[PDB]
Amino acid sequence: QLQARRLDGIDYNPWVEFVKLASEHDVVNLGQGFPDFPPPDFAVEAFQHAVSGDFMLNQYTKTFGYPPLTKILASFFGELLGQEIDPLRNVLVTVGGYGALFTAFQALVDEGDEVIIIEPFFDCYEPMTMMAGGRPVFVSLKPLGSSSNWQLDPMELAGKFTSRTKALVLNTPNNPLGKVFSREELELVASLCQQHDVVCITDEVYQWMVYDGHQHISIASLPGMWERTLTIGSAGKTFSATGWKVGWVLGPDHIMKHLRTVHQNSVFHCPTQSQAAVAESFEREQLLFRQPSSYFVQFPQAMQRCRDHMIRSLQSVGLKPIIPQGSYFLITDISDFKRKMPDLPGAVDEPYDRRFVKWMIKNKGLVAIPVSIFYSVPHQKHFDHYIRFCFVKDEATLQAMDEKLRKWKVEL
Amino acid sequence: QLQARRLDGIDYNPWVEFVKLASEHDVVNLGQGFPDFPPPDFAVEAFQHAVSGDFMLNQYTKTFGYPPLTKILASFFGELLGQEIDPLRNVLVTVGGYGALFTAFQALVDEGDEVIIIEPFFDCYEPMTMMAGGRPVFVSLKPELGSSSNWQLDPMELAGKFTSRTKALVLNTPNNPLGKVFSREELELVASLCQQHDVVCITDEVYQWMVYDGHQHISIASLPGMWERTLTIGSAGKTFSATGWKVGWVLGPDHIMKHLRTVHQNSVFHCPTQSQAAVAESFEREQLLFRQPSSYFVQFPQAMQRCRDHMIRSLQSVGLKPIIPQGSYFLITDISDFKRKMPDLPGAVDEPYDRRFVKWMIKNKGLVAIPVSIFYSVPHQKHFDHYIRFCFVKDEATLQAMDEKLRKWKVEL
């Protein structure tokens, strides 16, 4: 056959059928995982400055990152992690958090290695593991309810580790659930990674999107964890500018050198001007750190109000929200719908949630993402009764949501 | 071990130390493969427009490309290639030409596959082949001032490189570092063999517009029967003199491209939105002016041909022997006279002469060039150790500075 075997089973696209169906109807799109409003002025202005400034910013920068950006990432995140971070040795700028994840998997995961993935998982973790020859090993969080009460059972997790475990992928705050892992939960993960000599790949893109007094804790800051952790961030998720596609990985040289090898043999450079914009945007937030005018203070407070609005609204039609402590997202249990309306049309073994989302788009004008997309196939039948909404939305979008909900109840 | 076996032998990269030594001396840098002057006004303005326009351009766009960009790529390159290109099935936007290459290799090259690479080659072709489990197989171009056109792709040598295990051949035209623009006859040779053996041609055409002396860029995908077995790669940075934009693309038939889309979906997922909008606007501008005297694709290569000619004249003043290129940003000079007269430059054992010569030239003459041996397979480096690569796509002030270094060197001869 023409194509490489590493592509086996990973062409499957869960997204396309729903975006197409959405495009066909008059919908309020709560499935999109990006803000439908502008980034803050200082971020937009930062990009404007980069594309009008020194003309040489139109040319290549350094392979492992634009130096002013790697300098500020090393300083700012070194303080947060309680670690001395060397920009040249410990920081790599990537094409978003996606590119960072891909670079980590391609550097470290080999044929036969196992990778522990925590369900529900950001969906790419599984096919990226597969493409690198790894065998995904799944552990499921155990389910108004709160994302904090979804438990990572210590015995179940410990039982997943074997001599073949290469890495565990931690995502906190979690997409799609919105769970913010506690210190105790991270100490559990850390203990097992140290016991078994496993690398923790930690996807922290939603670091700043935390609510209700919950604190983001970085596992790399725990005793002994810096030397076995890769920490990933996203400028897009940080500054509400998802189309910038700038991310980074932070970690120790003995691991990062391998990510550098992948990087130099794949993209070689990241774009120069967006990196300058991200550096300037961090400079702004560093200067205003913990102050009332800062984005990292103001924005999660605003989005918490959007969250609360959406929680109230969706209950009005019998959806049961699970209150998230972080991220852009909340999930709603649709079990009551499955009980009252079990026989929705769909394909063989098509989980109920996927059929429900299609029904909801066509009949009610609301888009959500079926949560079964974030589960291993063998677990989708059990975890078939949740859907993911995004509340990081313009106030006009939330008003339009409420209009659809009026129609759902009153025209029913 | 911690790291994946696919990284074996590819952690060595020449570039980080070449930028290092140059940065540390007072020098005219002719080793850098990008312009040291601005992109044209319409391109800079296009990016300014993208970052000051529709606020939603700050958010994700479509996975396989910003639709206005895939639209203009499909219509403009469709015309150039004589092909009906579907933007959704035949175009993928990538992170530069580098990302395009990477995507192609990861989609198609598998353990045990052979990939034919033509020396001198843009250096990443080898490690990207190896990371994908492939076995690089090398064919060497065979070397008045010489001309890049006269470096021959021997038909019998090339034919003998094809086997039942050949998956792909990597064609780069115009070639970096040599500046060779492949002729119709040479492309017909490659095409014949790819059809005979059922091989995919991965064609790196980033320097498409940088052609001189009336030489025509011909795309192998335009030849009979080749669209169905060719991936064609371009780079916005090399097209619009904006290397830091890092936007590229692949063009090809759906039955191959679907596999590149799989790699893309499982790696970066999106390319940045706003630079894609800038590239789309820039191509729209050039398509509207296509073949007209005010177009960048007419004006710019004419301007850079003058810079090329200036450099050819100047470098001869110190005894370097240029090979006249028909395209690209680059020329190479033969340094065999220096090797003969000054053989004993310091260096490691088995360090190729060109690498030693470049270090000596940087420190003592104030000029940076790139040793051409980095564009050869390791077993051939000892035999192709007497060329260095210069970049002439440079501001007038830089070429003036070059001449000031050369005049001092000449007195020191």
B85 and B77 Cβ atoms separated by less than 8 Å: yes
How far from the centroid of its chain's Cα atoms is residue B311's Cα? 20
Distance, in Å, from the CA atom of A102 to the CA atom of A213, rounded to the nearest integer, reads: 32
Length, in residues, of chain B:
413
3-state secondary structure of B117: strand
> Under the phi-then-psi rule, with left for phi > 0, alpha for psi from -120 to 50, and beta for the rest, what region is A94?
beta
Distance, in Å, from the CA atom of A95 to the CA atom of B182, rounded to the nearest integer, reads: 34
3-state percent breakdown (helix, strand, coil) of chain A, nearest 5: 45, 15, 40
Q: What is the DSSP letter of A210?
A: B
Distance, in Å, from the CA atom of B82 to the CA atom of B223, rounded to the nearest integer, reads: 9
Q: Does A227 touch chain B (CB under 8 A)?
A: no
Substitution target in A261, A274, A328, A394 with the highest count of B β-carbons within 10 Å is A261
B360 and B21 Cβ atoms separated by less than 8 Å: no
Q: CA nearest A55 in B: which residue?
A: B38
Distance, in Å, from the CA atom of B335 to the CA atom of B389, rounded to the nearest integer, reads: 11
Helical segments of B242-333, H only: 254-265, 273-288, 296-316
Report which residue type is found at A223.
P
Which residue of B4, B57, B95 is in closest CB contact with A110?
B4
Q: How many angstroms separate the CA of residue A108 from the nearest CA in chain B?
A: 4
Distance, in Å, from the CA atom of A221 to the CA atom of A208, rounded to the nearest integer, reads: 16
Q: Does A92 touch chain B (CB under 8 A)?
A: no
Strand (E) or helix (H) holding A158: helix A154-160
The domain at B1-40+293-413 falls in which architecture? Alpha-Beta Complex (3.90)
Q: Does B400 touch chain A (CB under 8 A)?
A: no
Name every chain A residue with its beta carbon within 8 A of the beta carbon of B128.
265-266
Peptide bond into A120 cis (omega under 30): yes
Q: Does B177 touch chain A (CB under 8 A)?
A: no
Q: Does A67 touch chain B (CB under 8 A)?
A: no
* B185 Cβ contact partners less than 8 Å away, ≥ 6 residues apart: none
Angle made by CA atoms A129, B136, B201, in degrees to the nearest 5: 85
Give, in order, the Cα–Cα distances in Å from A381 to each of A75, A137, A142, A190, A301: 46, 18, 15, 31, 36
Which residue of A48, A240, A264 is in closest CB contact with B51?
A48
How far from the centroid of its chain's Cα atoms is residue B395's Cα? 20
φ, ψ for residue A386, nearest 5 deg: -130, 150
Q: Does B58 touch chain A (CB under 8 A)?
A: yes
Q: Superfamily for A1-40+292-412?
A: Aspartate Aminotransferase, domain 1 (3.90.1150.10)
Spell out the domain ranges in chain A. Answer: 1-40+292-412, 41-291
HSE on the CB side for B237, CA within 13 Å?
Answer: 28
A6-11 long-range Cβ contacts below 8 angstroms, 24+ apart = A6/A130, A6/A131, A6/A132, A6/A133, A6/B106, A6/B110, A7/A131, A7/B107, A7/B259, A7/B262, A7/B263, A8/A130, A9/A127, A9/A130, A10/A127, A10/A130, A10/A131, A10/B262, A10/B265, A10/B266, A11/B258, A11/B261, A11/B262, A11/B265
B182 and B193 Cβ atoms separated by less than 8 Å: no
Name every chain A residue with its beta carbon within 8 A of the beta carbon of B57.
243
CATH topology of domain B41-292: Aspartate Aminotransferase; domain 2 (3.40.640)
The closest of A23, A21, A20, A30 to A401, measured between CA atoms, is A30
> Under the phi-then-psi rule, with left for phi > 0, alpha for psi from -120 to 50, and beta for the rest, what region is B332?
beta
How far from the centroid of its chain's Cα atoms is residue B67's Cα? 26
Give, in order, the Cα–Cα distances in Å from A58 to each of A178, A209, B138, B271: 38, 32, 35, 17
Q: Which residues pair with A201 in a beta bridge?
A: A169, A230
φ, ψ for residue B330, nearest 5 deg: -120, 155
Which residue of B58, B244, B274 is in closest CB contact with A59?
B244
Going by the annotation, the residues of the binding site of B for substrate are: 33, 176, 389
The closest of B151, B150, B167 to B114, measured between CA atoms, is B167
Report which residue type is found at A375.
Y
Method of determination is X-ray
For A41-291, CATH gives: 3.40.640.10
Instruction: Quickly tell me which residue has 């517009």 as its tokens.
Output: B209
3-state secondary structure of A301: helix
3-state secondary structure of B259: helix
- Asked if domains A1-40+292-412 and A41-291 share a fold, the reply is no
Which residue of A10, A51, A267 is in closest CB contact with B48?
A51
Name every chain A residue with its beta carbon within 8 A of the beta carbon of B10.
261, 265
Torsion of CA B255, B256, B262, B267, to 10 degrees: -160
Distance, in Å, from the CA atom of A297 to the CA atom of B99, rounded to the nearest integer, reads: 37
The 10 Å Cβ neighbour count of residue B54 is 13
- Strand B114-119 relative to strand B166-172: parallel, antiparallel, unpaired? parallel
Which residue of A2, A37, A95 is in closest CB contact with B95?
A95
Q: Does B263 touch chain A (CB under 8 A)?
A: yes
Helical segments of B94-146, H only: 96-108, 125-131
Q: Do A268 and B109 touch (CB under 8 A)?
A: no
